[PDB]
């Protein structure tokens, strides 16, 4: 499977990072997506770097559990629903 463990930074720009937990993923053509608790659009796409996906946008509502999914093209690969206020790095 393609599980992952995200962590967010926000003490007052709203940042959210997600790193794959599986050891050797191809990590090509697949992209992360964040839905729910957004302003203008219902879903927004991450940005890849090395093997970590990064989304930095102050348009977060910070309410409820937001849905982080992985898509390969237009089909979803896996999904999870996490509260962004609990995933905070030290």
């Amino acid at each position: 499977d393609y599980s992952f463990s995200c962590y967010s930074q926000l003490e007052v720009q709203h940042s959210l990072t997600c790193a794959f937990e599986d050891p050797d993923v191809n990590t090509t053509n697949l992209e992360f997506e964040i839905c729910g608790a957004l302003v203008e659009v219902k879903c927004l796409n991450f940005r890849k770097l090395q093997e970590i996906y990064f989304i930095e946008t102050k348009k977060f509502l910070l309410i409820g559990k937001s849905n982080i999914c992985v898509k390969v093209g237009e089909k979803s690969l896996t999904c999870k629903k996490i509260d962004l206020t609990t995933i905070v790095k030290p």
Partner: antibody
Amino acid sequence: QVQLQQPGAELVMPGASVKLSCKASGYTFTSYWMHWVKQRPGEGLEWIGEIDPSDSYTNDNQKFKGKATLTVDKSSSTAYMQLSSLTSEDSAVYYCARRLYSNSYYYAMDYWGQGTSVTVSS
Amino acid sequence: DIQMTQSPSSLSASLGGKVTITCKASQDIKKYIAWYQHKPGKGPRLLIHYTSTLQPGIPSRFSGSGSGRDYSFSISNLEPVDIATYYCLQYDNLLTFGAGTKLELKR
């Protein structure tokens, strides 16, 4: 070829709690969401809530708080709506519909069910 | 919550004609509107999603348009198989349906 089957009608006296079923066939069950709609005899359509079969996440209308509780059995590929404390104002037709393919929360549906004509009377 | 005022409540046109139904939202729903056909007894059937994008199997005689708060839907070359009701639906923050439009064939 997407089938959504529900019982045509059920009669249960007020004050009890029933569980309407919605059995889906023709698609992967953990890939599409399910919505429920209440329709009074003369009134139109009223969305009740939506359930995600992947992990039983609910986005429900606040008008039906404590009344409707959307659950899901993944092995049988079935979605349930539990209505508690039935009254005469709950006697309506309850449709279940498959949501379009999306990860967003509020999204429309395409294929519907036949609806359960629930009648509440002692 | 978002009031979806539909108009008219009931209309009628001739065989092979064209009918038009409008829906006005109480706020900007950002082109998130769909139109549903509802025959008596049987369940609803989606015709057009996202203002004007059709569904597989829906003929090209069902058109739609609109912006922000005002949207319109049209049926051309009326066939006798289109005698039903038609509902709107917004999906920007909630799921509010319109009042419906009873279509009638003028024979």
